[PDB]
Task: structure prediction
Amino acid sequence: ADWAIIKQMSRYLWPKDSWSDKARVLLALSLLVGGKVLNVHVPFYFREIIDRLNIDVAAVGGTVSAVAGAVIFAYGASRIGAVVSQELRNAVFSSVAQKAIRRVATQTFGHLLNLDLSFHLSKQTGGLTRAIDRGTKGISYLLTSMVFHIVPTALEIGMVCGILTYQFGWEFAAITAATMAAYTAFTITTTAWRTKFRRQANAADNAASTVAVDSLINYEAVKYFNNEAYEIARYDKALQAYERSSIKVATSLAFLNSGQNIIFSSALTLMMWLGARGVLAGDLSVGDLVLINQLVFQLSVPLNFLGSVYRELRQSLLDMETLFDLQKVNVTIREAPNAKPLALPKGGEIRFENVTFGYYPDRPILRNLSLTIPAGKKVAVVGPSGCGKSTLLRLLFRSYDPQQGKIFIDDQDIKSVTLESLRKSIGVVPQDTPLFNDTVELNIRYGNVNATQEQVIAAAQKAHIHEKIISWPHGYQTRVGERGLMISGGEKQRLAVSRLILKDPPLLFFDQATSALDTHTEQALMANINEVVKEKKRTALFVAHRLRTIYDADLIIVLKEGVVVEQGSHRELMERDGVYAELWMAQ
Amino acid sequence: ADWAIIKQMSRYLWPKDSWSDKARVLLALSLLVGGKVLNVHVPFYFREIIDRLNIDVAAVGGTVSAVAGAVIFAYGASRIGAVVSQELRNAVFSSVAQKAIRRVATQTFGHLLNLDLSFHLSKQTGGLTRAIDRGTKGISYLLTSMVFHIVPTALEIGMVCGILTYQFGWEFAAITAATMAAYTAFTITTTAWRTKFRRQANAADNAASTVAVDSLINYEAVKYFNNEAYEIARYDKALQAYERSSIKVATSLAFLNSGQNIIFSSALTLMMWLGARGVLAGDLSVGDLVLINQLVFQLSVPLNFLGSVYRELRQSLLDMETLFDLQKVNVTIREAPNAKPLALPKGGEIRFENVTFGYYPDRPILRNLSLTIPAGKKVAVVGPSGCGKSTLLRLLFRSYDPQQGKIFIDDQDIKSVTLESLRKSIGVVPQDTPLFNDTVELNIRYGNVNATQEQVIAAAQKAHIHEKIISWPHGYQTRVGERGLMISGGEKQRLAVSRLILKDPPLLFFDQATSALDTHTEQALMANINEVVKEKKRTALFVAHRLRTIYDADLIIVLKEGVVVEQGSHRELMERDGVYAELWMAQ
Ligand SMILES: Nc1ncnc2c1ncn2[C@@H]1O[C@H](COP(=O)(O)OP(=O)(O)OP(=O)(O)O)[C@@H](O)[C@H]1O
Ligand SMILES: Nc1ncnc2c1ncn2[C@@H]1O[C@H](COP(=O)(O)OP(=O)(O)OP(=O)(O)O)[C@@H](O)[C@H]1O
Ligand SMILES: [Mg+2]
Ligand SMILES: [Mg+2]
Result:
């Protein structure tokens, strides 16, 4: 299972473009091998010191150079060389690992921004970004563990087994092979038993994080309804589950490490018994026994390093499948192949044909819908609340596809049109208008990020917000706060209208753009919007509950129960005495 | 500096309540000392094996029991005992560490929920929860490092210095003291040089995380204005800064580890030179030399463990000051001492007296404001957009304090009244109404979490939303999505009205509660709200831009430029021919 994830992740070890990080990888591998070779030499120099001081105890000599000085310096310099080269390849491979981090994070964020609207509506705000940054931390930790601690250790077992089989009998090879067999059997058994606790801890951690994020987003809601203790209790219960699972994780890791060190230390005892038997039989010397012990002990050091941090490693593994499964989710809003960009031969003629749509398959909202928005005219869509008139503005934008029927913009099915050209041809003021946690000028220029300050000021006049922004102390640098909450709702809505004005699209969709404005302000703003639409011959589609802003619309579409019940102008709908008349007579 | 943070954190080692986690701490410390003692015995048993196999090479014997069997088993069993007791105290102290994690996280979340509104408006959504969970990870990692790797290592230097000074000369004590001096000097110098890179990496990581979170919150904004590439580029630049700083961090950690291992291995070489000189002079034996080397090497193992994970440790330290500084921020909205709960002798008579307020000190918004909301009457506050009429509803709630003047609810200054009683006496429908990412029924029952299903259904009828919820497939279990975006805005607003209805407060504040509703729906909802207010004699304060919902209000307050320009009823404001007349004649 996880072998597939490791195979997919291995492409970041071997990039095919830069060729300089390839040189860094090769240099890190060469320093890895050199460090392991020096680390395996240092027991040989210790054996040489032991033997030269043991056999030369009878003759009188000095330790400066006569007996053991050169090999003392050799031992010290080889220890220094081993550790220095290990840290040097750590420093070298750090750059490759961090470049892989930035590339993975940017790619995954870019895939997130192209996912469907339904996924982003049904997710949790904290969960996605937690998956992103925790997955990047996982990539970094797992790459650094595999290159820094796992491969060097496996190479250490390789050379230790080879040297103990070469310089000594096959008995040591048999002992170490049985040790690796028992070690692997114990490790896989206890890992198959440790997986439940570690996935439960991750699930409870995610639950606690989502509780905290959802409580902090709705801080005004928790203070308005005095549910601070309720949110604290919810967070506390989630953390109770998390600490129970984490205690089980740690308690079962201290069984893994304990048992695998039982196996390793029993191996060390048996090998030292074989060495003692060899020493007493005259085959081996004291230095050979200390060589055996030192080799196996220097093998122990990386092994209990891996045992100590196994929690973080395998945590990064389940972070691997959660982030990669986030990358593997498909998009249901896909461009048809060989798709031409959207063209507007005449004005933005929008035509719905037999459109049937429901976010849930058992509840159709638009039911056999068929409406024709004329080209270049101001068109108003009215109706009861929840009737499905702001679901036009997100299904015409192709955030959702109809189950039946087709949508045409100038006789072009929007399914057979590139998403990029369609979404640049449509500008919409959303019903709720959250702003980025930045200044006023940045939020205004978000409509066209490469627009100059004069265009931003012009869109500020056209949205009837500029004089207020001048009257403020910070001017256009006034911070709007989190989700545009440090300014008033009417000013925030006018900023959204300013974004639409600065974008200047052929198709304009206003989803109650004057809902939070007083009568004078909405009157002036509607005057500016109407003269913009009439001057540029834009196809403007106004979804509005305030009928007094759209009584001069060219076409008024009354939408009830997801079907057009009546169309026509204001006066025609008055002599129809229909649903629009009942809406208007109720003032 | 950081010593103060460690002192403050040390209270979680010594809890004063449970006394059972105190027993766990003592058991972990006892197993710590026992494991270190056994780990220091195992070189002594290796020395004994070496000596018994060296001096007894002349006489013929077997290794089973005659020469070295008992001490081979002693060596192996002591190694097993050391590692087993180390992992056992890790398992024991894990529970104490995790309980400290849950307590710290719950306390810090609770302090966050009681902070000021201004702090929550001016913060970043990702940043606070990232600080919380990353600080909890820091608490866990730093406690486990200090009890698991730092104190055991310091105890190891203690016993290694003591044993080498006891069994051998003062020369080894002088060498090891000079080694500790050089080690500490190098470590503090390179740590003072490493702090810049590690704080820059944390700052860039926070910047990248905030960019990602702000982009994902505004997914509809980035798709509506086609700024996916812009957000990807912003995230990529932040990640560029992060990877540059992380590469510098790792490159400077591989200098710390390299140099401190230079110092340690030079110490080991010098001590083995002294041991060789002692062996050649007849004072020492071969086993004593291997004892020296084994003691110092088993000291090396924890030291390069700390060197390998020093990044994570000191990262947890700067997480310590960021989370603790989050806990040290004060609240400016504080209850007066000896504060009595809010009483309502007559109805909810609200009176503003000379109130002067501005979120920025250089821009007053309410300027010498003086209005008197009568008791038990429906009162409407109208005015231009941005005039400061929804800043009444958050300054009467005491989310902000006035700079000058006082606010009275039944002749009780709300500054001299407990926040809990004041905020339970006030229920408000906010201007924007985000919902929790849960079902419809949970969002409705958030008004009173301990209310039964019949009361939830009753508030659903009174908010004119129930029949729609029945018509849905999932009923009251319909998920509303992130921030209530998987339902329509009118239905979301009616759910907020339902929360206010279920809360049933004495004071009702509606901040444009019918802004996203059609004329029939707002007419029916206003009928239900008006009969609720009249039946229970509630003091209802309606902030509304739709004047047709509040033409029957008992008092209409016209608020322009932050001062009451005119009051009175609808008819009186008509014969005044003032600002309200100009609002109404503009229809
Ligand atoms: N995923 C979804 N996204 C949007 N609406 C959904 C979804 N699932 C179910 N619905 C329901 O489908 C209906 C679609 O109506 P729509 O959202 O267009 O109303 P609206 O025109 O926005 O009304 P208003 O503008 O007054 O809020 C809503 O009542 C909503 O409750
Ligand atoms: N942190 C802040 N939160 C809210 N408003 C702020 C803040 N800082 C400054 N302001 C300004 O203070 C004024 C307060 O007015 P308020 O937000 O009550 O207007 P409003 O009643 O919401 O008008 P509308 O309902 O038409 O948007 C606003 O004009 C706003 O620009
Ligand atoms: Mg709508
Ligand atoms: Mg308002």
Summary: The domain at 434-504 of chain A is CATH 3.40.50.300 (Rossmann fold). The first helix of chain A runs from residue 2 to 9.
